[model samples]
Target chain A: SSATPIVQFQGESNCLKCFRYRLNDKHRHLFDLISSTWHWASPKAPHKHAIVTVTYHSEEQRQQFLNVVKIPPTIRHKLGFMSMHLL
Target chain B: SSATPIVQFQGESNCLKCFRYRLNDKHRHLFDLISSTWHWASPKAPHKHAIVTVTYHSEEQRQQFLNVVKIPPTIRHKLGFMSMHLL
Candidate 1:
């Protein structure tokens, strides 16, 4: 039922405080869970929020990622979860 | 009593997303509420995030800003928020 391995993490990735908490090695199991990440620039305006398009090796990895913290078009993707953006 | 008008908005500003929202004109009243802002880079390793050292010209402005979204030692100013390294 999944489409892509890339999931865009909404506003959280754009800020420093949350990122530190997430990126810390203490959370390395979570950090390494995703294959790689691209820190994207903020969205084009009238649009609000920046997003990190997180890439996973498979849809199952994508499922595990759903537990992570949370946005919109608000950059809301087809996935449409406020706290989770999975594409 | 607080010491400085400079209250740092953590991690959010460093990323492309929330910074745009916070920095955008829709929130310009909020953005302009502070006197000026300097976006800080992501924090050093072990440290997980980035921040913006938002400075205000007056202490009165600081309180309004505290209401805004939220650090790292992130550089601890002599004022104890954040700053650049000589290195």
Candidate 2:
């Protein structure tokens, strides 16, 4: 059992329906595999993971994470970056 | 044409699918009305409004926003607060 994962959404889309960010099938499959280990009954598990959801809140926040990750457009495209601002 | 709206999501659900916060029909309708005026072409419209999406990232953050709004359980229920921490 692992501690509850920290899944943070960093976006400026209040309505989830409008926030159309999505992980492709491959990443989604990977995430599903990892998420299967999560147990809501035991939220304090020592092995915790963080999954941060980045949204378009501000140019600064967007650039900050992108600079840290330095993910390429190929992967960003797979991550559903519909705009050049992400690349 | 108005500037793009500020729709911020404040939650610890990195996966948007996992962030199950929603506004009930009435609120959703109201939001639809307001959102119709939004124009992506003119993101700098002076009539800007902020709709903050609050999520469960940490106890302190959750409590802080709750204190500011002072929203009652009944309204919170309408806003889909499945947990007591929000009310």
Candidate 3:
């Protein structure tokens, strides 16, 4: 049986929204895509993918993520999983 | 009658302050310049020409604009009339 992909909404009530695709594994591809999208003042649009492993599947699920991270809307879409569902 | 240009600043005190060029007449040219400058993540500096209209209506207007816009303290030297103004 496929795992029901966890598609969750993550972000502050007032701040811009983002997503967190949480699975119990190291998703290098997913992380890379997200880190790349975050924009900075500089012309460079590149960032290193480094997921701080935590006890919870996602920070959004944990209720403590806002204190630790800044997430964007595009990241939410990516983590929400356009295609793929686990049962 | 040639009216002085109308520019209204509309934004929250803490929010990102932006210029609202409020001319009674439809300024197709000025609006186009604004729409083009809104994007920071996109590639393309070709929208560079539109700013010239606002940058310096003439050498006189240019001086007034620079005074009002307050070009960044560092890049004021390289600031060109033809350059696009990003908010």
List model 3 lDDT by residue over A1-87, tens digit each: 222223243222212111222321223323222321222345563442222222234434444433434444323322333222421
Query: Which one wins by lDDT: 1 or 3?
Result: 1
| Rank list by DockQ | 1, 2, 3
Span of 10 residues, lowest total lDDT, candidate 1 chain A:
A78-87
Candidate 2 is scored at a TM of 0.18
Error of 1 at A25 (Å): 6.2
lDDT of each: 0.42, 0.30, 0.29
**DockQ of candidates 1 onward, in order?**
0.34, 0.05, 0.03
Candidate 1 deviant stretches above 4 angstroms: A1-4, A8-53, A71-75, A78-87, B1-4, B8-13, B16-27, B30-51, B68-87
lDDT of 3 by residue, B1-87 (tens): 122232222222111111222221333333223221222234665332212123223445535544545321111122333423332
Summing lDDT over every window of 10 consecutive residues in candidate 3 chain A, give the lowest-scoring window. Answer: A12-21
- RMSD values for the candidates in order, in angstroms, are 8.9, 17.4, 14.5
Q: TM-score of chain A for candidate 2? A: 0.24
Model 2 segments beyond 4 Å from truth?
A14-21, A24-26, A33-87, B1-87
Give stretches of model 3 more than 4 Å off. A1-61, A70-87, B1-32, B35-78, B83-87
Report the number of the highest-DockQ candidate. 1
Judged by DockQ relative to the true structure, which candidate is superior, 2 or 3? 2
TM-score of chain B of each: 0.40, 0.25, 0.28
